[PDB]
Design a protein around this ligand. Structure first.
Ligand SMILES: CNc1ccc(-c2ccc(/C=C/c3nc4ccc(OC[C@@H](O)CF)cc4s3)nc2)cn1
Ligand SMILES: CNc1ccc(-c2ccc(/C=C/c3nc4ccc(OC[C@@H](O)CF)cc4s3)nc2)cn1
Ligand SMILES: CNc1ccc(-c2ccc(/C=C/c3nc4ccc(OC[C@@H](O)CF)cc4s3)nc2)cn1
Ligand SMILES: CNc1ccc(-c2ccc(/C=C/c3nc4ccc(OC[C@@H](O)CF)cc4s3)nc2)cn1
Ligand SMILES: CNc1ccc(-c2ccc(/C=C/c3nc4ccc(OC[C@@H](O)CF)cc4s3)nc2)cn1
Ligand SMILES: CNc1ccc(-c2ccc(/C=C/c3nc4ccc(OC[C@@H](O)CF)cc4s3)nc2)cn1
Ligand SMILES: CNc1ccc(-c2ccc(/C=C/c3nc4ccc(OC[C@@H](O)CF)cc4s3)nc2)cn1
Ligand SMILES: CNc1ccc(-c2ccc(/C=C/c3nc4ccc(OC[C@@H](O)CF)cc4s3)nc2)cn1
Ligand SMILES: CNc1ccc(-c2ccc(/C=C/c3nc4ccc(OC[C@@H](O)CF)cc4s3)nc2)cn1
Ligand SMILES: CNc1ccc(-c2ccc(/C=C/c3nc4ccc(OC[C@@H](O)CF)cc4s3)nc2)cn1
Ligand SMILES: CNc1ccc(-c2ccc(/C=C/c3nc4ccc(OC[C@@H](O)CF)cc4s3)nc2)cn1
Ligand SMILES: CNc1ccc(-c2ccc(/C=C/c3nc4ccc(OC[C@@H](O)CF)cc4s3)nc2)cn1
Lengths: 62, 62, 62, 62, 62, 62, 62, 62, 62, 62, 62, 62
């Protein structure tokens, strides 16, 4: 294997633009999960027999 | 293997722009999780048989 | 293996821009977790059989 | 292995810009965790069978 | 292994800019943890079977 | 191993800029931990089976 | 005018890759100009009533 | 005018890669100019009524 | 004008990589100019009514 | 004008890498100029009505 | 004008790497100029009506 | 004007690395100038109507 004058991207996020002008929110969470932001996960490898990689709003409850 | 004048990106986040002008929030969390920010996780490797890498708003409760 | 005049990025975050003009928040957390900031995790390796690497808003409770 | 005139970044954060003009907050935390700052974790390796590396807003309670 | 005229960064944070003009906060923490600053952790290695490296807002209570 | 005219950074923080103009805070902590400063931890190695390296806002209480 | 989290390129050259394997040249210039290299000019502004900006192989002779 | 978390490039050259393996040259210049290298000019402004900015192989002779 | 957490490049050269393996040259210049190296000029401003900024292989002869 | 946590580069050269393995040259200059090295000029300002800033291989002869 | 936690570079050269392994030269200059080294000029300002700043291989002869 | 926790570089050279392993030269200069070393000029200001600042290989002869 060899790379000459090249590039690679094995899991990336970019150019995430967010313009929020004159907003209003009123969240009233009482249990559980409310996720109203801007998230950006970027992984290369997640092994493991049960891994819950990259969760956003998870309520895993017995 | 060899790289000459090259580049690599094995898990990255960049160019995350956030313009919030004249906003208003009223969150009233009472239990659980409220995540209204700007998050950016960037990992290369997560092993392990049960790992919960990159959680955002998790409520894992018995 | 060899790298000549090259570059590598195995887990990175950059160019995180945040412009918040004329905002207002009113969070009233009473238990749990409220995360309304700007976070940036950047890891290379997380081993271990149960690791919870990169949590943001976690409530792991029995 | 050898590197000539090259660079490496195995877990880094940079160029974190935060412009907050004319804001107002009113957090009233009563138990749990409120994290409304700007955080930047950057690790290379986290071993261990249960490690909770890079937590931000954690409430791990029985 | 050898490096000639090169560079390495195994866990670093830099270029953390924070401009806060005309702000106001009113935090009223009564138990738990409120973290509204600017934090920057940068580690190379964290071993140990249970280590909680890089916590910010932790409430680990039985 | 050998390094000629090179550089290394195994856990560092730099270029932490903080401009706070015309602010006001009113923290009223009554128990727990409030951390609204600017922190910068930078370690190379943390061993030990339970180490809690780099805590900021910790309330570890039974 | 203002730019937020943006970029500009007013005259640039990049990603010039040149792979020359097992070549042979025999140039026998006797007057004039022979230019068999790799050139990359990049200017922003060239004023002047007669300017000959960015010449490569010029023989301007009376 | 103002720039926040942005970038500019008003005349630049970068990522010039040149791989020359097993070559042979025989230049026999006898007058004039032979330019078989790798050149990279990068200017911002060249004024003047007759300027010959960025010449490579010039023979300007009366 | 003002720049916050930004960058500028008004005339620059970078990332000039040159790999020359198993070459051979035989230049026999007898008058004039032979330029078979690697050059990198980088200027910001060149005034003057006749300036010959950034010449490489010039033979300006009456 | 003001710059906060920013950077500027008004004429610079960097990251000039040159790998020459198993070469051979035979230059036989007899008058004029032979320039087969690695040059890097970097100026900010060159005034003057006739300045010949940044010459490399010049033969200016009447 | 003012700069806070910032940087400037008004004419600089850096990261000039040169790896020459198993070479051989045979220069036989007989008049003129042969420049086969590694040069790095870095100026801020050159005034004067005729200045020849940053010459390398000059033969200016009547 | 004022600078707080900042830096400036108005004409500098640094990080000039030169690795020459198993070389051989045979220069036989007979008049003129042969410059096969490693030079690094770094000036801030050169006035004067005719100054020849930063010459390397000059033969200025009538
Ligand atoms: C050919 N026959 C076979 C073949 C395969 C199998 C087989 C394969 C995989 C598994 C995995 C079982 C798991 N159990 C848990 C419990 C909890 C948890 O995470 C808890 C939480 O707190 C963390 F987020 C993650 C996991 S994965 N079981 C059986 C059986 N028989
Ligand atoms: C062929 N037959 C087979 C094959 C495979 C299996 C098999 C494979 C994997 C597993 C994994 C079991 C786990 N249990 C927990 C509990 C808690 C936890 O994390 C707790 C929390 O506090 C941390 F976030 C993480 C984990 S992973 N079990 C059985 C069985 N049989
Ligand atoms: C083929 N058969 C097999 C194969 C595999 C398995 C198997 C594999 C993995 C596991 C892992 C069990 C764990 N338990 C805990 C408890 C607490 C915790 O963290 C507590 C918190 O305070 C820290 F955040 C983390 C962990 S991981 N168990 C069984 C069984 N059988
Ligand atoms: C094939 N069969 C197998 C295979 C694997 C296993 C197996 C593997 C891993 C584990 C890990 C168990 C842990 N328990 C704790 C408790 C507390 C804690 O941290 C407490 C807090 O204060 C610090 F943050 C961290 C940890 S990790 N258990 C069983 C069993 N069977
Ligand atoms: C194949 N079978 C197997 C395989 C593996 C295991 C196995 C592996 C790891 C563990 C770890 C157990 C721990 N317990 C604590 C308690 C408190 C603490 O920190 C307290 C706080 O004050 C500091 F922050 C940290 C730790 S880690 N246990 C069992 C069992 N069986
Ligand atoms: C294969 N079977 C196995 C394998 C592994 C294990 C195993 C591994 C690790 C551990 C660690 C147990 C610890 N307990 C404490 C208590 C307090 C503390 O710090 C108190 C505070 O004041 C300081 F901050 C730190 C620690 S770490 N236990 C069991 C068991 N079985
Ligand atoms: C409405 N009527 C008008 C309007 C416009 C004009 C008009 C406009 C431009 C010009 C330019 C004339 C020039 N002459 C030279 C000579 C040599 C040289 O460079 C020499 C070499 O060594 C450098 F590389 C560059 C230049 S530009 N002339 C007349 C006349 N009438
Ligand atoms: C409306 N009527 C007008 C309008 C415009 C004009 C007009 C405009 C420009 C010019 C320029 C004339 C020049 N002459 C030289 C000679 C030599 C040289 O450089 C010599 C070499 O050694 C350096 F490299 C550069 C220059 S530029 N002339 C006339 C006339 N009439
Ligand atoms: C409206 N009418 C107008 C308008 C404009 C003009 C006009 C404008 C510019 C010029 C420039 C004339 C020059 N002559 C030389 C000679 C030698 C040299 O450099 C010598 C070498 O050794 C250094 F490298 C550089 C220069 S520039 N001339 C006339 C005339 N009429
Ligand atoms: C509107 N009419 C106008 C307008 C403009 C002009 C005009 C403008 C510029 C010039 C410049 C003339 C020069 N002559 C030399 C000679 C030698 C030298 O350098 C010698 C060497 O040794 C150093 F490297 C540099 C220079 S620049 N001349 C006339 C005339 N008329
Ligand atoms: C509007 N009309 C105008 C406008 C402008 C002009 C005008 C402008 C500039 C000049 C410059 C003339 C020079 N001559 C030399 C000689 C030798 C030297 O350096 C010698 C060497 O040893 C050092 F390296 C440098 C210089 S610069 N001349 C005329 C005429 N008329
Ligand atoms: C509007 N009309 C105008 C406007 C401008 C001019 C004008 C401007 C500049 C000049 C400069 C003339 C020079 N001559 C020498 C001689 C030798 C030397 O250095 C010798 C060596 O040993 C040191 F290295 C340096 C210099 S600079 N001349 C005329 C004429 N007319």
């Amino acid at each position: 294997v060899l790379y000459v004058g090249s590039k690679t991207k094995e899991g990336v996020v970019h150019d995430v633009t967010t313009v929020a002008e004159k907003t209003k929110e009123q969240v009233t969470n009482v249990g559980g999960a409310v996720v109203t932001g801007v998230t950006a996960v970027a992984q290369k490898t997640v092994e493991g027999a049960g891994s819950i990689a990259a969760a956003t709003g998870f309520v895993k409850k017995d």
